[PDB]
Structure formats: structure tokens, C-alpha cells
Amino acid sequence: EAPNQALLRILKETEFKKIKVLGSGTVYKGLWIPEGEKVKIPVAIKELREATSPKANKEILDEAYVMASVDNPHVCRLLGICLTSTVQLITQLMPFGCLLDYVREHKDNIGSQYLLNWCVQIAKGMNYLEDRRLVHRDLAARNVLVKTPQHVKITDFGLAKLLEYHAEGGKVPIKWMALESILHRIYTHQSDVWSYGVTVWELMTFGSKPYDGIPASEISSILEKGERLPQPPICTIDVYMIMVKCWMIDADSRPKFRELIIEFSKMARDPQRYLVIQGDERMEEDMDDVVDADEYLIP
Numbered sequence: 001e002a003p004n005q006a007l008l009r010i011l012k013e014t015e016f017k018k019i020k021v022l023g024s025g026t027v028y029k030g031l032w033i034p035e036g037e038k039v040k041i042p043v044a045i046k047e048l049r050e051a052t053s054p055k056a057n058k059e060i061l062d063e064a065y066v067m068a069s070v071d072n073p074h075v076c077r078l079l080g081i082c083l084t085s086t087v088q089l090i091t092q093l094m095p096f097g098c099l100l101d102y103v104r105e106h107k108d109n110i111g112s113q114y115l116l117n118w119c120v121q122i123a124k125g126m127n128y129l130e131d132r133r134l135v136h137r138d139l140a141a142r143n144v145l146v147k148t149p150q151h152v153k154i155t156d157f158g159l160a161k162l163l164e165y166h167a168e169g170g171k172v173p174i175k176w177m178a179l180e181s182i183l184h185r186i187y188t189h190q191s192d193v194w195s196y197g198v199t200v201w202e203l204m205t206f207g208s209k210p211y212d213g214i215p216a217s218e219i220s221s222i223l224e225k226g227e228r229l230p231q232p233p234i235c236t237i238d239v240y241m242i243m244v245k246c247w248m249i250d251a252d253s254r255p256k257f258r259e260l261i262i263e264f265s266k267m268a269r270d271p272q273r274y275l276v277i278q279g280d281e282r283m284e285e286d287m288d289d290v291v292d293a294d295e296y297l298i299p
């Protein structure tokens with residue numbers, strides 16, 4: 001194995017203004033102003049529910065380890081941590097929130113070019129995690145964030161593992177998981193391919209809930225019997241046949257992210273041929289030195 005020469009950047013609490021809450025685990029939107037640099041970087045800041053929980057701190061630093069270890073345009077990178085009473089994670093602000101909330105809010109304005117372009121960008125992000133021997137284990141629309149409508153990134157490395165992997169319980173999302181994941185707590189790049197299939201299905205159904213109202217104890221059995229999620233209305237058989245390939249029992253019979261990139265990107269060249277949508281053709285404070293995390297490099 002190669003050595004992980006990732007830099008973990010420690011930040012002074014004075015270097016960022018929390019600006020607003022985004023969630024409650026609690027998450028703030030903020031500005032980061034690196035020491036005498038004359039730039040302001042919109043950031044997301046996360047800290048613990050209870051400061052002095054040793055179990056909680058092990059968790060967030062594991063998240064930090066992984067996020068420090070990734071540099072790809074379709075993956076969230078750690079900017080730094082702050083070692084206050086409550087440890088603060090600092091990442092790139094994704095202003096438009098999670099892609100699940102986004103498809104739901106904007107279903108009447110989302111066209112095929114966007115949907116297929118997302119499918120590609122997620123396939124690229126996941127393919128990069130695979131290059132880096134990394135297994136996400138919690139890929140879902142809820143865990144893909146929207147920097148712009150044209151640009152999404154994979155997030156929430158809370159469950160992510162460097163290198164099969166054999167786990168041991170914990171509240172885990174059954175409806176996104178490969179069969180071999182539910183049965184034998186096995187996880188691979190190919191089990192992430194399954195979750196990718198469910199993620200694409202989330203998008204193509206404009207955020208609808210998989211196996212809606214079916215309790216998760218049943219799921220194992222249903223999939224054994226041969227059942228899968230339905231063809232979404234907008235989906236040509238071309239797009240749906242791709243999703244179905246992600247839900248094969250033989251993990252190695254499933255497609256590879258590098259292939260999914262290729263297949264979705266061919267379809268993105270002629271989007272109205274692959275996704276049929278009603279009327280598809282139709283579809284900040286006083287801060288001067290602001291710069292997106294993506295243009296802010298340090299050696």
C-alpha cells in the first residue's frame with residue numbers, strides 16, 4: 001500500500017464567521033478567511049451534538065481522515081478542522097443542498113440534460129473513490145450535494161472504508177444496499193454500483209421513496225425472489241436496463257463506474273432520446289473577495 005500524504009489543515013476559530021444554521025450533529029453555513037490571504041471562502045461547518053462524547057469524536061475524525069484523502073471535482077473535500085471543545089469539520093459550502101431535496105423542489109423545471117449530466121458526474125466521483133480503493137457504503141441522492149444545478153459532488157463519508165469489507169451492524173440503509181450487503185455484511189465497489197442504481201432511480205422518479213411503505217425486514221426476501229424497483233415513467237428502456245444491470249445478484253455481472261460514465265455520457269449527448277419529460281424543450285452579503293473552495297488551492 002502507498003503512504004497517505006494528505007495534509008490535515010488545523011484552522012483557528014477566529015478564521016471563520018458562522019453566518020446561519022442549516023441543520024441539527026449540527027451544521028452551519030459560514031465564511032472562511034485564511035490568515036492574511038484577502039479571500040473569503042463559503043464553507044459548511046459541522047460539530048457534535050455533545051462536546052465530551054469520545055464515541056462522537058472518533059467518528060468525526062474518521063470522516064475528516066477520508067475527506068482529507070480525496071481530490072476530485074465530483075467529491076466533497078475537507079478544507080480543515082478546528083480543535084475547539086466541540087471539533088468543527090470545515091468543507092466547501094454546497095449552496096443548493098442535497099440532490100434529493102433539489103429534485104423534489106424543482107421536479108417541474110428539471111430537464112433530461114441535467115438528470116443524465118448528474119448520473120455522469122456521480123459515476124465519475126464514484127469511479128474516483130474506486131481508483132482510491134474507497135467504498136462509500138452510503139451512496140444515495142440524500143448524500144449527493146448541489147454546488148450549482150450544473151455541478152454535484154458525493155458527500156457523507158460517515159460509513160466510508162479504505163481496502164470485500166466485513167461490517168458488524170449499526171442503523172444502515174437497506175433500501176440502497178446490495179443483496180450480498182444485507183445477507184453477509186459484504187461491501188465492495190460493486191455494492192456501491194447497486195446503491196448508484198437506486199440513486200439514479202431516485203433522480204428519475206424526481207425523489208420518490210424506494211419500495212415506499214415496504215418494511216426493510218421484507219426487502220432481503222423480495223430481492224431474493226427476483227423483484228426490483230419499477231421502470232420510472234420518464235425512462236426509456238435504455239436508461240432502465242442500465243439501472244437493472246446495477247441490481248444483478250452476480251456483483252461482477254454489474255457494470256463498472258467507468259462504464260456507467262461512458263454509457264450515461266453517450267446518452268447525455270442526445271438526452272431527449274433517453275428521457276421523455278412533459279415540456280423538456282421549454283425548462284449574498286456585501287462580500288467582494290469571495291472565491292469558491294474549488295479555486296482556492298494551497299500547495
Ligand SMILES: */C=C\C(=O)Nc1ccccn1
Nearest residue numbers: 044076091092093094155
Ligand atoms: C462538499 C462539502 C460539503 O459536504 N458541504 C456541505 C455540507 C452540508 C451543507 C452544505 N455544504
